Amino acid sequence: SRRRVVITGMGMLSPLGLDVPSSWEGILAGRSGIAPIEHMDLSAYSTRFGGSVKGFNVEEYLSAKEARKLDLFIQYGLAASFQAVRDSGLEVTDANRERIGVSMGSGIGGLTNIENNCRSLFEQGPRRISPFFVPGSIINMVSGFLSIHLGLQGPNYALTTAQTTGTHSIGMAARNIAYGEADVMVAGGSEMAACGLGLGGFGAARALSTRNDEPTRASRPWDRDRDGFVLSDGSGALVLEELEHARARGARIYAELVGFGMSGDAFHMTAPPEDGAGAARCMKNALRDAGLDPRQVDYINAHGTSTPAGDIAEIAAVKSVFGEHAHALSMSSTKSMTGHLLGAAGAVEAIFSVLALRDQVAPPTINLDNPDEGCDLDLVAHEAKPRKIDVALSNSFGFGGTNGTLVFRRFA
Amino acid sequence: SRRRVVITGMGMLSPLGLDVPSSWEGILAGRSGIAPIEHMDLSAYSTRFGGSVKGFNVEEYLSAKEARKLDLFIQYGLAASFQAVRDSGLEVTDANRERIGVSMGSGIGGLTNIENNCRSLFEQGPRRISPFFVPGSIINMVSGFLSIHLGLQGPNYALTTAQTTGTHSIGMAARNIAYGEADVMVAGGSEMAACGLGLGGFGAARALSTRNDEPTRASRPWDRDRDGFVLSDGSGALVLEELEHARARGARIYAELVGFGMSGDAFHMTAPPEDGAGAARCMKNALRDAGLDPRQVDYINAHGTSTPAGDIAEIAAVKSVFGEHAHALSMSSTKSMTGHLLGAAGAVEAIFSVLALRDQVAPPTINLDNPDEGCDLDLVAHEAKPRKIDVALSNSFGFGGTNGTLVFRRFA
Numbered sequence: 046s047r048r049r050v051v052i053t054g055m056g057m058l059s060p061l062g063l064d065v066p067s068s069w070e071g072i073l074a075g076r077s078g079i080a081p082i083e084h085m086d087l088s089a090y091s092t093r094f095g096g097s098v099k100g101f102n103v104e105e106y107l108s109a110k111e112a113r114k115l116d117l118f119i120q121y122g123l124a125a126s127f128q129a130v131r132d133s134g135l136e137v138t139d140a141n142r143e144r145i146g147v148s149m150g151s152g153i154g155g156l157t158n159i160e161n162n163c164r165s166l167f168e169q170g171p172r173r174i175s176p177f178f179v180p181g182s183i184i185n186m187v188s189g190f191l192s193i194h195l196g197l198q199g200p201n202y203a204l205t206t207a208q209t210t211g212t213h214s215i216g217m218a219a220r221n222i223a224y225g226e227a228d229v230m231v232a233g234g235s236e237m238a239a240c241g242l243g244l245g246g247f248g249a250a251r252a253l254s255t256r257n258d259e260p261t262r263a264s265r266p267w268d269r270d271r272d273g274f275v276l277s278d279g280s281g282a283l284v285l286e287e288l289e290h291a292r293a294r295g296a297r298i299y300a301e302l303v304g305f306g307m308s309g310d311a312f313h314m315t316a317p318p319e320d321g322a323g324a325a326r327c328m329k330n331a332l333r334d335a336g337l338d339p340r341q342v343d344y345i346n347a348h349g350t351s352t353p354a355g356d357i358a359e360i361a362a363v364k365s366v367f368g369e370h371a372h373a374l375s376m377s378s379t380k381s382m383t384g385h386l387l388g389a390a391g392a393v394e395a396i397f398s399v400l401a402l403r404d405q406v407a408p409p410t411i412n413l414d415n416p417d418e419g420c421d422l423d424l425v426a427h428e429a430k431p432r433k434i435d436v437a438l439s440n441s442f443g444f445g446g447t448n449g450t451l452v453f454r455r456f457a
Numbered sequence: 458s459r460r461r462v463v464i465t466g467m468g469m470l471s472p473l474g475l476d477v478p479s480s481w482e483g484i485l486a487g488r489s490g491i492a493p494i495e496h497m498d499l500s501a502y503s504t505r506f507g508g509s510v511k512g513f514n515v516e517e518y519l520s521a522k523e524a525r526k527l528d529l530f531i532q533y534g535l536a537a538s539f540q541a542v543r544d545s546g547l548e549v550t551d552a553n554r555e556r557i558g559v560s561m562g563s564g565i566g567g568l569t570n571i572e573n574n575c576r577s578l579f580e581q582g583p584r585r586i587s588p589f590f591v592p593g594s595i596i597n598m599v600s601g602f603l604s605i606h607l608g609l610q611g612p613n614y615a616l617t618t619a620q621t622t623g624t625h626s627i628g629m630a631a632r633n634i635a636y637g638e639a640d641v642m643v644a645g646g647s648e649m650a651a652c653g654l655g656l657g658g659f660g661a662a663r664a665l666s667t668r669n670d671e672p673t674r675a676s677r678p679w680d681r682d683r684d685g686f687v688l689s690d691g692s693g694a695l696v697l698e699e700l701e702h703a704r705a706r707g708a709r710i711y712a713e714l715v716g717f718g719m720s721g722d723a724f725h726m727t728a729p730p731e732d733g734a735g736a737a738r739c740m741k742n743a744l745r746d747a748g749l750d751p752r753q754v755d756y757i758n759a760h761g762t763s764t765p766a767g768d769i770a771e772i773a774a775v776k777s778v779f780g781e782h783a784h785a786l787s788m789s790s791t792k793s794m795t796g797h798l799l800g801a802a803g804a805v806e807a808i809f810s811v812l813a814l815r816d817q818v819a820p821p822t823i824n825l826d827n828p829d830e831g832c833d834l835d836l837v838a839h840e841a842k843p844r845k846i847d848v849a850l851s852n853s854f855g856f857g858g859t860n861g862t863l864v865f866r867r868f869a
């Protein structure tokens with residue numbers, strides 16, 4: 046059989062807040078974390094805005110000397126990781142440290158550090174490159190640094206599945222636990238790609254909204270006026286825990302992780318198939334994994350990136366999977382407020398999906414002023430919607446056509 | 458319940474050849490793939506050699522029009538994946554495409570690509586960034602591009618765990634099959650970090666051999682005169698397959714994958730503990746995973762990087778895990794010849810471990826002229842050793858204290 050897996054801790058940095066309760070407050074209020082990027086000259090760029098983390102103090106987590114060694118994406122991951130473990134009340138002992146592992150990932154990793162060490166390399170040559178460049182930039186260093194700080198000796202790994210990283214990190218962490226390889230895992234993702242190379246990289250593929258005049262209105266999933274996604278920074282971390290382990294130590298359980306679906310589109314490098322056939326298979330796989338009928342699903346945290354083709358594919362995939370229940374369920378994109386945290390997107394959207402269970406409210410899809418053709422579902426336009434939510438889905442569809450779905454259920 | 462997993466296909470680019478057999482003949486003949494580097498000018502660098510892939514012809518695999526858009530690491534990953542799938546005899550169909558996934562990883566990913574696009578950003582501005590920069594550079598696109606070309610709609614992901622990437626990738630792809638999430642996975646990794654930032658970054662940390670006047674003698678695992686690892690490029694992919702599915706289609710089976718271990722050292726960001734404590738935990742998890750008596754292990758393919766601390770820690774780990782039987786088994790580092798393919802190390806070395814079982818020979822550790830204090834095991838100095846091998850183990854250890862062990866045995 047299979048052990049059940051519960052959420053006992055959550056941590057986050059978002060464009061909405063420096064922790065979960067502040068971010069969730071922004072979500073339910075419909076606030077935007079999008080704004081022109083500061084302390085960066087973007088004159089020559091077609092996009093000049095996104096979701097920055099505002100006022101982050103790494104010295105709440107790290108000495109200034111240890112933070113200097115580490116790319117912002119790693120700092121963000123450690124901050125969410127540290128928040129999550131503390132949120133869980135968990136006490137690490139010699140008796141259980143071998144049973145606690147980490148799977149924190151990144152889409153893109155250390156661009157900002159890579160850009161700054163390039164400056165030195167090109168200007169002054171190879172000897173001005175930092176000694177800490179490699180371990181300070183590689184994606185498995187949130188997992189590494191976290192495991193070293195807390196004495197975690199369980200499964201230590203990192204995923205990098207572009208915009209699906211957060212969803213895949215959590216899902217596969219839940220497997221580790223379910224199949225008895227670990228009793229506890231810290232899982233999710235972090236991202237800081239708002240450098241030249243990120244805005245330029247995504248800018249060159251014309252993947253980004255270029256609505257520089259109204260940055261708060263740029264991210265407008267399923268609206269007829271959307272012109273691409275909004276690039277955002279942050280981290281999410283959940284503490285995943287075997288149910289009996291959680292009950293024994295008297296843990297507060299937010300919710301149960303019942304289902305994880307993966308699939309591949311095998312279609313295109315950056316664009317989904319128009320009918321969302323891959324997101325449909327992935328959701329069906331997640332619901333089968335959870336032993337649930339599609340009818341039982343109440344709330345979907347959509348990928349909902351605000352790209353023409355991505356938004357429309359997700360409607361086709363929901364209508365396909367859910368048939369006559371697809372109007373009954375509520376589906377929103379919190380990217381309408383946060384923008385697209387890429388590899389952290391699924392970590393923070395898992396947390397929003399768990400909080401929708403706790404608080405019995407669908408987050409809004411803000412900026413959905415004029416739904417596009419066939420976007421006739423309950424997309425929770427403009428304002429939060431209190432309702433019954435027993436089961437909640439979080440979807441992530443990324444480059445390479447890599448799909449992930451998480452199923453959360455109320456736990457009592 | 459838990460299914461058995463066998464190797465039906467393998468593929469490789471190494472510094473010793475453009476496939477498996479050509480690389481293997483070099484391994485058995487104690488040939489070095491290490492040479493001064495020619496694809497760029499390294500006079501400002503403290504280390505000017507490595508294991509390059511020689512005469513790689515991407516137009517054996519890909520149209521030049523697609524090849525141009527992709528980092529060499531992805532080209533290398535696809536070349537090894539394509540070989541492995543062809544070598545498997547597997548035929549992809551509507552009936553089985555949902556059950557065939559891919560997990561091809563990398564340590565650092567498209568560093569060359571990110572460097573070149575950085576140069577363009579700094580010298581010429583953001584409008585000279587390739588539209589292919591992102592999908593052409595991010596680590597999950599070996600998994601992405603493979604799935605698209607072959608139509609693999611199974612689990613689609615990528616691991617980034619530094620120098621452990623290949624072992625973890627192979628090990629967790631086996632767990633996918635073991636637990637029924639897939640019947641087939643293509644798993645391994647690819648690295649091409651031989652650019653300014655690579656040799657520069659590893660140079661800045663003083664990790665690399667600087668034996669520039671004798672590059673073939675630089676990588677000398679467990680030799681008293683070792684002075685850092687040698688940086689090498691390439692790819693390894695295997696087709697992992699449920700046993701009954703392999704039997705059902707008359708698949709040739711190289712060997713069985715009976716054991717996977719992970720652990721975290723939780724010691725240091727880049728230094729292994731001198732006692733090999735995390736390594737020992739990892740190998741013990743793997744042998745317990747395979748239900749084996751440690752005395753059944755005949756051959757260990759060591760991580761064996763040719764760093765002072767790494768090499769001694771491995772001896773300590775092996776002595777501690779294997780006690781007196783540590784003196785009966787054969788251990789070698791093929792890094793003595795290939796150098797360190799970082800994220801791809803685990804993938805090529807897993808294939809060497811399988812060929813050690815097929816051909817009943819321990820590959821040599823070349824350059825082991827003066828074994829260091831305490832390095833008194835059978836490390837197969839200088840020359841291949843024909844011997845009985847039923848059980849073969851492949852170890853990797855990475856930055857972040859991340860450990861991986863794979864256990865293989867003959868299948869009849």
Ligand SMILES: CNC[C@H]1COc2ccccc2O1
Pocket residue numbers: 105106107126127128130131194
């Ligand atoms: C063990 N629970 C506390 C976590 C979160 O707060 C931390 C902050 C800094 C360093 C370690 C930390 O550990």
